[PDB]
Design an enzyme around this catalytic site. Structure first.
Site, PDB file in Angstrom:
ATOM      1  N   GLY A 116      19.561  14.290  -3.014  1.00  0.00           N
ATOM      2  CA  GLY A 116      19.250  14.703  -4.403  1.00  0.00           C
ATOM      3  C   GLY A 116      18.262  13.752  -5.056  1.00  0.00           C
ATOM      4  N   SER A 117      17.589  12.913  -4.245  1.00  0.00           N
ATOM      5  CA  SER A 117      16.408  12.184  -4.743  1.00  0.00           C
ATOM      6  C   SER A 117      16.732  11.174  -5.841  1.00  0.00           C
ATOM      7  CB  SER A 117      15.313  13.158  -5.207  1.00  0.00           C
ATOM      8  OG  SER A 117      14.860  13.888  -4.063  1.00  0.00           O
ATOM      9  N   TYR A 153      27.391  19.176   0.287  1.00  0.00           N
ATOM     10  CA  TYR A 153      27.785  17.839   0.810  1.00  0.00           C
ATOM     11  C   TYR A 153      29.257  17.763   1.202  1.00  0.00           C
ATOM     12  CZ  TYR A 153      23.072  16.429  -0.116  1.00  0.00           C
ATOM     13  OH  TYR A 153      21.726  16.368  -0.162  1.00  0.00           O
ATOM     14  N   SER A 207      18.100  11.992   2.426  1.00  0.00           N
ATOM     15  CA  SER A 207      17.199  11.873   1.264  1.00  0.00           C
ATOM     16  C   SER A 207      17.477  10.500   0.614  1.00  0.00           C
ATOM     17  CB  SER A 207      17.400  13.107   0.300  1.00  0.00           C
ATOM     18  OG  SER A 207      16.765  12.963  -0.976  1.00  0.00           O
ATOM     19  N   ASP A 230       9.033  17.791   6.676  1.00  0.00           N
ATOM     20  CA  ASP A 230       9.238  16.967   5.490  1.00  0.00           C
ATOM     21  C   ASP A 230       7.950  16.169   5.317  1.00  0.00           C
ATOM     22  OD1 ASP A 230      11.818  14.421   4.608  1.00  0.00           O
ATOM     23  OD2 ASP A 230       9.859  14.795   3.682  1.00  0.00           O
TER      24      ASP A 230
HETATM   25  C1  LIG Z   1      13.347  18.400  -5.775  1.00  0.00           C
HETATM   26  C2  LIG Z   1      13.714  18.404  -4.500  1.00  0.00           C
HETATM   27  C3  LIG Z   1      14.895  17.605  -4.029  1.00  0.00           C
HETATM   28  C4  LIG Z   1      15.084  18.222  -2.643  1.00  0.00           C
HETATM   29  C5  LIG Z   1      13.625  18.409  -2.207  1.00  0.00           C
HETATM   30  C6  LIG Z   1      12.997  19.117  -3.393  1.00  0.00           C
HETATM   31  C7  LIG Z   1      13.423  20.612  -3.276  1.00  0.00           C
HETATM   32  C8  LIG Z   1      14.756  20.775  -2.497  1.00  0.00           C
HETATM   33  C9  LIG Z   1      15.753  19.623  -2.787  1.00  0.00           C
HETATM   34  C10 LIG Z   1      16.969  19.611  -1.889  1.00  0.00           C
HETATM   35  C11 LIG Z   1      18.194  20.384  -2.455  1.00  0.00           C
HETATM   36  C12 LIG Z   1      19.310  20.387  -1.413  1.00  0.00           C
HETATM   37  C13 LIG Z   1      19.510  18.975  -0.790  1.00  0.00           C
HETATM   38  O1  LIG Z   1      20.240  18.162  -1.716  1.00  0.00           O
HETATM   39  C14 LIG Z   1      18.187  18.280  -0.390  1.00  0.00           C
HETATM   40  C15 LIG Z   1      18.406  16.951   0.341  1.00  0.00           C
HETATM   41  C16 LIG Z   1      17.394  19.277   0.392  1.00  0.00           C
HETATM   42  O2  LIG Z   1      17.334  19.428   1.616  1.00  0.00           O
HETATM   43  O3  LIG Z   1      16.663  20.049  -0.541  1.00  0.00           O
HETATM   44  C17 LIG Z   1      17.361  18.144  -1.659  1.00  0.00           C
HETATM   45  C18 LIG Z   1      15.984  17.445  -1.661  1.00  0.00           C
HETATM   46  C19 LIG Z   1      16.103  15.964  -1.912  1.00  0.00           C
HETATM   47  O4  LIG Z   1      16.853  15.459  -2.790  1.00  0.00           O
HETATM   48  O5  LIG Z   1      15.401  15.277  -1.175  1.00  0.00           O
END
Ligand SMILES: C=C1C[C@]23C[C@H]1CC[C@H]2[C@@]12CC[C@H](O)[C@@](C)(C(=O)O1)[C@H]2[C@@H]3C(=O)O
Length: 323
Positions: free
Chosen positions: A92-93, A104, A168, A266
């Site tokens: 979730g960045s 999760y 992430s 990615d």
């Molecule tokens: C704003 C975001 C945050 C992303 C990338 C982009 C769009 C999709 C999101 C998610 C949403 C689902 C998962 O948590 C995740 C790990 C995934 O696979 O996609 C997220 C990813 C991240 O946090 O790196």
């Protein structure tokens, strides 16, 4: 090609998250919490796995969710036979999701089935409200808590056989916790990183090539780094770019063996591989699994070869590093 169900699921996140990030670097937090898909813990096993929520640090309200095959059990004696404890940090960045988030919760359940061990999923404090180094503090808190529970311990030397894992931002957190562990002589059996999040002030080839093609944009990557890093910092801060201009080499530390899973679609794949390269260069053991056809989140849906491959690599790595 992205499988349709992956495309729909990740697009649903992408489009929702579009409306939660504010231009001024603040976040629609109440709305984000309201829109997240989450499940409660449940002491009653679903498909052989039970879960329990527990606050481990009252000063910052730090909660974990514990998963095991099936409260007081934390007191139980160290298991005779070794088993893994996986400490998991959700993605979730640095800003989104929770240990209760269904994507999760489901992944941790699968980790327990796969490891025949215990999973501790950490509800770390998130940005932008809580900036660097809070999430790292919380992961260190969680590591020390796990090491001190009799239940978590196993094998001859009755110790916790700990693996640090995350996707992430959680993979970033796992790394920094592992470094702190090595600095303090705390033993970590291995790190498991799924699309670990790293950055830097310049763009890599992969960043420029994959920008906007597979759910993720550089605008949003820049946004999340801005949200987590100190206000006066840039993407060459070591939290973001641990081996860049302001970085620190890890030669000589008792650092964990690493399983590093990288999605080729990615846009940050270049940095993850250079991360792996730097660990190897520092004398540490690294296994890299490149999933060339995989986008972010592929480990969330059991619908590609890469998914199956990676669950097997995870199982092999755990087995190999337990004894
Ligand atoms: C704003 C975001 C945050 C992303 C990338 C982009 C769009 C999709 C999101 C998610 C949403 C689902 C998962 O948590 C995740 C790990 C995934 O696979 O996609 C997220 C990813 C991240 O946090 O790196």
């Amino acid at each position: 090609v992205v499988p349709l169900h992956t495309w729909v699921l990740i697009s649903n996140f992408k489009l929702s998250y579009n409306i939660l990030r504010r231009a001024d670097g603040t976040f629609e937090r109440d709305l984000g919490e309201y829109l997240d898909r989450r499940v409660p813990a449940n002491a009653r096993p679903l498909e052989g796995v039970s879960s329990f929520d527990h606050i481990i640090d009252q000063s910052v309200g730090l909660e974990v969710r514990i998963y095991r095959a099936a409260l007081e059990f934390l007191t139980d004696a160290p298991a005779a036979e070794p088993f893994p404890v996986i400490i998991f940090f959700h993605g979730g960045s640095f800003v989104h999701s929770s240990a209760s988030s269904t994507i999760y919760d489901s992944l941790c359940r699968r980790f327990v089935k796969l490891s025949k061990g215990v999973v501790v999923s950490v509800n770390y404090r998130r940005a932008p409200e809580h900036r660097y180094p809070c999430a790292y503090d919380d992961g260190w808190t969680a590591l020390k808590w796990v090491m001190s529970q009799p239940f978590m311990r196993s094998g001859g030397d009755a110790q916790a056989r700990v693996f640090l894992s995350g996707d992430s931002s959680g993979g970033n957190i796992a790394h920094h916790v592992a470094v702190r562990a090595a600095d303090e002589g705390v033993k970590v059996c291995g790190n498991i990183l799924l699309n670990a999040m790293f950055g830097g002030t310049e763009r890599t080839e992969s960043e420029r090539r994959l920008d906007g093609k597979y759910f993720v944009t550089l605008q949003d990557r820049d946004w999340y780094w801005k949200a987590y890093l100190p206000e006066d910092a840039d993407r060459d801060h070591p939290a973001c770019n641990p081996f860049g201009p302001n970085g620190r080499r890890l030669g000589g530390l008792p650092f964990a063996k690493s399983l590093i899973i990288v999605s080729g679609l990615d846009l940050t794949c270049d940095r993850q591989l250079a991360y792996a390269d730097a660990l190897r260069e520092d004398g540490h053991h690294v296994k890299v699994v490149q999933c060339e056809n995989a986008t972010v989140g592929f480990y969330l849906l059991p619908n590609t070869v890469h998914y199956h491959e990676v669950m097997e690599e995870i199982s092999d790595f755990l087995n190999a590093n337990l004894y």
